[PDB]
A paper describes a structure:
Vertebrate KDM4A–C proteins contain a conserved double tudor domain (DTD) and a potential zinc-finger domain at the carboxy terminus. We show that these DTDs use an aromatic cage as a general mechanism to coordinate trimethyl lysine and, most importantly, the sequence specificity is largely determined by side-chain interactions with surrounding residues.
In dramatic contrast to KDM4A-DTD and KDM4C-DTD, KDM4B-DTD only displayed striking specificity for H3K23me3 (Kd=10.3 μM), with no significant binding to H3K4me3. As KDM4B-DTD also interacts with H3K23me3 with high discrimination, we investigated whether KDM4B-DTD engages H3K23me3 using intermolecular interactions similar to KDM4A-DTD. Indeed, KDM4B-DTD binds H3K23me3 with sensitivity to PTM states on H3K23 and neighbouring residues in a similar fashion to that observed for KDM4A-DTD, suggesting that the interaction network with H3K23me3 is shared between KDM4A-DTD and KDM4B-DTD. To pinpoint the residues that account for the poor H3K4me3 affinity of KDM4B, we looked for apparent clashes or missing molecular interactions in the modelled KDM4B-H3K4me3 structure. Indeed, with the N960A variant, H3K4me3 binding was rescued to Kd=303 μM, whereas the corresponding substitutions in KDM4A (N940A) dramatically decreased H3K4me3 binding, most probably due to disrupting the hydrogen bond with H3T3. S965 in KDM4B might also contribute to the poor affinity for H3K4me3, probably due to the lack of strong ionic interaction between H3R2 and S965; such ionic interaction is fulfilled between KDM4A-D945 and H3R2.
Numbering used by the authors:
A (entry chain B), B (entry chain A): 918 to 1026
């Protein structure tokens, strides 16, 4: 429930705790996929799945075999593992300083 | 009091009303500029100003002549009028389509 203009406390650019204001917010949904190489990715944007229109239908079955477009520009096969949505925020200290801070790093009243 | 993930209603580009999800939010600085033909704009972002790096030094002096980049991609002279902060939100319909919306255009539950 963190909102625009809300005053929170988070770590500085110096690594110290100060009150700052929330001036931005974003929701990012990322997929975890397992390649055959034994490798994986966890910052796969949903639109990159080409064997299923996840933007509309939502994420595949856990363990589902999928095809995706990779940072390659090319298409590969993989196993969909998990889906995770994260909240990220932009804060502004009394500094004038700004930083991009993860929801988990923010203390609120 | 609008939050990431919250389901709201707004007009899509069809001009009709649909449920959408808030996936973004920003506290956005908007410049008002006055064109020579007598027209205005009030949703001009600070980076659009070409005759000064407003992202760092802040807004130009009031009434100041500025060169800006417009929605057609070309550069024009304009008269900086005032500066304003507005809450804007990024929403996503079940389409998968998205829209950038002012807080005032949003109906909430």
């Amino acid at each position: 429930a963190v909102s625009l203009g809300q005053v929170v406390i988070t770590k500085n650019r110096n690594g110290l705790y100060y009150r700052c204001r929330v001036i931005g917010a974003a929701s990012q949904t990322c997929y975890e996929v397992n390649f055959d190489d034994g490798s994986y990715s966890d910052n796969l944007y949903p639109e990159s799945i080409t064997s299923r229109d996840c933007v509309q239908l939502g994420p595949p079955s856990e363990g589902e075999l999928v095809e995706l477009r990779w940072t390659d520009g090319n298409l590969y096969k993989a196993k969909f593992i998990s889906s995770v949505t994260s909240h990220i925020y932009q804060v502004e200290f009394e500094d004038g300083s700004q930083l991009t801070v993860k929801r988990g790093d923010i203390f609120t009243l």
